[PDB]
Design a protein around this ligand. Sequence first.
Ligand SMILES: CC(C)CCC[C@@H](C)[C@H]1CC[C@H]2[C@@H]3CC=C4C[C@@H](OC(=O)CCC(=O)O)CC[C@]4(C)[C@H]3CC[C@]12C
Ligand SMILES: CC(C)CCC[C@@H](C)[C@H]1CC[C@H]2[C@@H]3CC=C4C[C@@H](OC(=O)CCC(=O)O)CC[C@]4(C)[C@H]3CC[C@]12C
Ligand SMILES: CC(C)CCC[C@@H](C)[C@H]1CC[C@H]2[C@@H]3CC=C4C[C@@H](O)CC[C@]4(C)[C@H]3CC[C@]12C
Ligand SMILES: CC(C)CCC[C@@H](C)[C@H]1CC[C@H]2[C@@H]3CC=C4C[C@@H](O)CC[C@]4(C)[C@H]3CC[C@]12C
Lengths: 666, 666
Amino acid sequence: PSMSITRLFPALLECFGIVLCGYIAGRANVITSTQAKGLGNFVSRFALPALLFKNMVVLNFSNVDWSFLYSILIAKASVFFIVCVLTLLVASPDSRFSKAGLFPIFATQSNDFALGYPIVEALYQTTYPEYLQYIYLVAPISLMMLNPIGFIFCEIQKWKDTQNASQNKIKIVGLGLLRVLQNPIVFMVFIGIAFNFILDRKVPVYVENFLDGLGNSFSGSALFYLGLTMVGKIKRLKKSAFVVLILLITAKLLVLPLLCREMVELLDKGDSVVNHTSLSNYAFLYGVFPVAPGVAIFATQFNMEVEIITSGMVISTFVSAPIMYVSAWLLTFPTMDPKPLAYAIQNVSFDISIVSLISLIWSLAILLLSKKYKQLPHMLTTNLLIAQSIVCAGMMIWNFVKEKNFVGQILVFVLLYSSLYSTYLWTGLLAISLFLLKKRERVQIPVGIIIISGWGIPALLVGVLLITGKHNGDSIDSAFFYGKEQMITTAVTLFCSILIAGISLQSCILAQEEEQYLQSGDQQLTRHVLLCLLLIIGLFANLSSCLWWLFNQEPGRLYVELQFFCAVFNFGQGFISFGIFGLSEEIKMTCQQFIHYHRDLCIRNIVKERRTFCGCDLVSWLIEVGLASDRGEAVIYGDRLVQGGVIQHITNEYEFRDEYLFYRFL
Amino acid sequence: PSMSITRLFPALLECFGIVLCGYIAGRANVITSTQAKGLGNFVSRFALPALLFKNMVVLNFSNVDWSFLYSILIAKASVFFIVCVLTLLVASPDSRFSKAGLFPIFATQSNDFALGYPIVEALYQTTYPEYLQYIYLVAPISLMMLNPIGFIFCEIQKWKDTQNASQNKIKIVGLGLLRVLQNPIVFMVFIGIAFNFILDRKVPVYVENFLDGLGNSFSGSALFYLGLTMVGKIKRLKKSAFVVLILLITAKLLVLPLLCREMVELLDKGDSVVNHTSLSNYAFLYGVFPVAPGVAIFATQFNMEVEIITSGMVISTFVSAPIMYVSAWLLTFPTMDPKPLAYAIQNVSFDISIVSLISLIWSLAILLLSKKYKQLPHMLTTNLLIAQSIVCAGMMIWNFVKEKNFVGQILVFVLLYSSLYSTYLWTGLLAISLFLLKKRERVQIPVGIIIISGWGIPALLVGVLLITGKHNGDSIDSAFFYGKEQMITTAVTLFCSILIAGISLQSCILAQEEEQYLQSGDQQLTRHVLLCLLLIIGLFANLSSCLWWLFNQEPGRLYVELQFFCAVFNFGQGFISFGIFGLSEEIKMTCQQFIHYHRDLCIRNIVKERRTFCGCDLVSWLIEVGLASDRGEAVIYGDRLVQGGVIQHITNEYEFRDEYLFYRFL
Ligand SMILES: CC(C)CCC[C@@H](C)[C@H]1CC[C@H]2[C@@H]3CC=C4C[C@@H](OC(=O)CCC(=O)O)CC[C@]4(C)[C@H]3CC[C@]12C
Ligand SMILES: CC(C)CCC[C@@H](C)[C@H]1CC[C@H]2[C@@H]3CC=C4C[C@@H](OC(=O)CCC(=O)O)CC[C@]4(C)[C@H]3CC[C@]12C
Ligand SMILES: CC(C)CCC[C@@H](C)[C@H]1CC[C@H]2[C@@H]3CC=C4C[C@@H](O)CC[C@]4(C)[C@H]3CC[C@]12C
Ligand SMILES: CC(C)CCC[C@@H](C)[C@H]1CC[C@H]2[C@@H]3CC=C4C[C@@H](O)CC[C@]4(C)[C@H]3CC[C@]12C
């Protein structure tokens, strides 16, 4: 009925595929950091103002439900107040106010013009068209209400830092209000209100096409720019910063949706209980939008807490999508029957499985063409991705052979759950390999023994399940294909894997040292330990669901959520693996420019005699001088120099890269 | 009926308003030339491929009329062959091939993805939707048939710089084909055809939203980027280059549409004569699309004929719009009745007049706030724009009061045509002032006498016309309000104006020197002659139409076109006048970056002792060193330096500008 949910997955695919395209373009150095400024300016100064003005001139303010806006504003104000009070009472006095100026803003301001609006449009287009108008009502008002307090706190921190006690509160409040008044959203909305009243809710035909043309290009360009602005933002941090970031993202993505739902339940007291449920669900879905990059822009402008804010915004952007999908499906579940419920679970798992299969075959092609799996622990990772691809393919076959052929059904079930148990066990084997590498022991690794164990133990478990179990062809879900025996063998396999994971966790000298450094750096322990920390979340979810079903024989109103979560993890675990292990005239001009003018003073610190400069030191020196903005521009400049015959590698085998590679002048 | 024409003006307004926004953003240094590369890459590598693939997957090749495509291709091939043959026969042997490789491409390839498609969509969405599919069929194929040959010619020019007569024809053809195969349009269309046949003309729902999101952001972004790429392109050229440019634009915008119409007349031999007429009228206005910037990109890549190609592309882009509008209206005219025809003329003139009044009041406000009209010849220009604004307002009043009141309509007519005669005379007075300034005589200019004459002679003419004329209130057009006497007065006024126009055409010394330079440069004599010529063109058109009506008393089937042209010029002459007249952590980082490392060697060539460097020399030196790409980067860098307390003006009154203003170090 309401909240058509089958249209949400393509909308999420749009929203995050454009972001992924932007990230890939930025990271492959197609677009550098300087060239992204043009796209950012076009999006912020011409497309968003046009979209806001066009949508705000026609709003019909006499037919707007203000209860929803009041509830959302009350929830946001409550979250802001709580975060500000806790930050003031907890943070150290040296940089207290700055935190209280930005942490509440981080946990309240969301990204709903670029990401939230397509989702809301897809969910509520033909069912509740009046909901799409609320976004343009809620996003600006919040900036009109909560941003000034944060800006005032930041100005107070700046005043303390400068120690200019002669200032008064009037100037601080004036600066705080002026910073929020100059935002294009605020005054564009004000002008939209003014022209809405002047023009009697009608857009002249002369400017309709112009406004539509500028407004239709906002969403995709903003998604691309958001993807571009995440190329190098996530960096290593400390434990305290990590805990603060986890708390902030939990406040943004968990506490706020629940508070919005509670406020909508309290304030709204209308008839048509169906509409009340729809409004509460809409509030919950609105609460889960990620943090807007405008907060990072504010932090950069104030030059305070920029790194933690940027990292948190980037992380929350990616964390929000599974939360959105699962929350929407869970809220749609109550208005369903058990057989359509199972069909919906099958369909969602099939969609996740097919997208994950495409991503996994792409990642496998990359890994095979890299030809780096011959040394540990890349081949175990290759086996893990192979098992994930096989389980995705097995489920896609199962969705069609569920009630088509018998022998095909048994064969598909065997393949699918052998692959599932293979992934479960391979998590533990990878953890064991990482722990063994941690011991730094120069002992041979039984690669053959571990691989045959990992690919034969699940086969033996499936065989004994077939021998001792009872077939049940009336079950739509493959989890209950046999029943008690399948459940107990899955539970014991998960328990063993989790226990294993927990227990486990002209210069020859220059050439030899650089190849030794390359060999040492090829062992990417960070990514492997990240994967062998992330998989146990889903392993724990699976084990908890199995134990809950075993202990609670009578099905309560919690096993459906566990089924959905475990299926989503089981058939989307390949996304994590893809995210980890898946990613002339001007030449002459720059050549003579470098040779003639500033060639001198270059060889003073970065070049020394060796029995002749690195790759990182030259990039750092170029950044220091001012010939580049980031590492990308330095890499492009070095490529320009090398292609022109200015410098060359010693071995004549590597191009200009930001590694520990040595080059010589010509 | 067919070809809904009342909604073409908003489409043109959108298409060129986004271009104007891009040009203003680029010229005001909001977006620098380096930062535009990101927008260009996003447009050319992600949005256009997505749009092309999405449109090519669903095309229904079994229901496509190939006669239109064949006729367009034949006309384009004929134009290409003619231009190539004439260029080969006429051009000097120094660069005979290079021009022959680029001139036929300039006159054939058009801009139909960004500009042509919105126009075709607006004109034909409701009446003939199938026409919308022809663009994506015509634009790619043309390249596949015409781009190689020309490219081969360019390769021959490169072969003329190698002095290797033996080798290699095969290599030349291979390079020519490889340059056209790597264009995203070509292989995107090929992949679209392949997936069209694979997918049975159906796109999966998973990628529908992604393709729609990337494809919907192409038109506005491409228009903005096109506007951005026209900031510093039009430059002074030679007479021969000007003649070649005029010939090339005439071939592109005049010969090609007529040839397309003729080929469609010859080949298409179908039924439903109305459909044949509509398809032949669609053949026309396809050849009036301006030159695509891809030709300029090709010229830059080949590094040959770059300046003439860029200037011609920009000029054709700006010239095509009135040609499109007038051609479409003239083609639509035959399917109308006399009274609806007159109403359509009134409506088109009213629309042009209202847009021109908005533009003119903007320009007048800018000129008044500039406070530079106190010296000749700016105040005469101010009077000219005042008269144009008054005539626009008078016509907008007339359209509402054409049949409302007697005294009101008489007063409105008097004001309107007094303003029209005022503009006609003020053209000649501006010509007289320019000629007097050319004589370089230090004689006082009777500004009061000339302004009194210019604002009084039209009043005397309209008064004597009212006294001796006869009222005719049954005419919708204001031209025949009185009859033959009004035509005689208009003709004699135009003849007098045309004759007049034709007949006429520390810091002791540095401060005064720069003041004298500013005074000399304030008299912008370069643009005034161009404005005079542009108004003379329309005055000549008006006089020709008046003489044609006077000599040809019986109305043939040519007076409607002259009426339309006269109305368009009379009520859009303000657009010409608007075009001529009307258009920190980083700080400290850059200031100590300049101070610490490369502060030295700056005072070696440009800075010298004076009784101390101009901004132009600093900009040129910064460009030469490599710290800036164009004048914009140098200007931004100088602003950063000045705001950081590095250099300051002698008078401390001028910010960092690319003028002859001396600056001193701190
Ligand atoms: C939730 C399901 C059912 C719907 C489909 C969601 C996917 C389209 C999302 C989910 C996880 C996303 C990924 C999560 C994390 C990343 C890493 C991200 O890069 C970084 O975070 C690196 C930053 C740096 O190096 O500074 C690039 C996008 C990517 C691959 C994302 C691409 C889009 C993905 C696959
Ligand atoms: C034809 C009518 C009925 C429809 C509306 C058309 C307008 C939207 C067009 C027609 C003429 C155009 C102008 C023609 C020329 C210019 C100059 C152009 O700048 C340059 O050419 C300078 C280039 C340089 O300095 O290098 C900026 C856009 C502008 C004002 C154009 C803006 C858009 C205009 C007013
Ligand atoms: C359950 C399935 C369907 C979806 C899982 C989504 C979440 C849990 C996964 C999908 C891809 C993952 C990301 C993949 C790659 C990276 C880059 C790394 O440097 C930090 C972690 C990070 C950012 C991961 C965080 C967790 C992540 C966002
Ligand atoms: C008849 C009315 C309605 C429309 C007239 C359109 C044409 C003829 C006019 C409108 C604005 C004009 C432009 C205004 C400004 C400039 C900049 C100048 O450095 C070169 C000429 C150029 C580029 C003009 C060329 C002619 C132009 C394009």
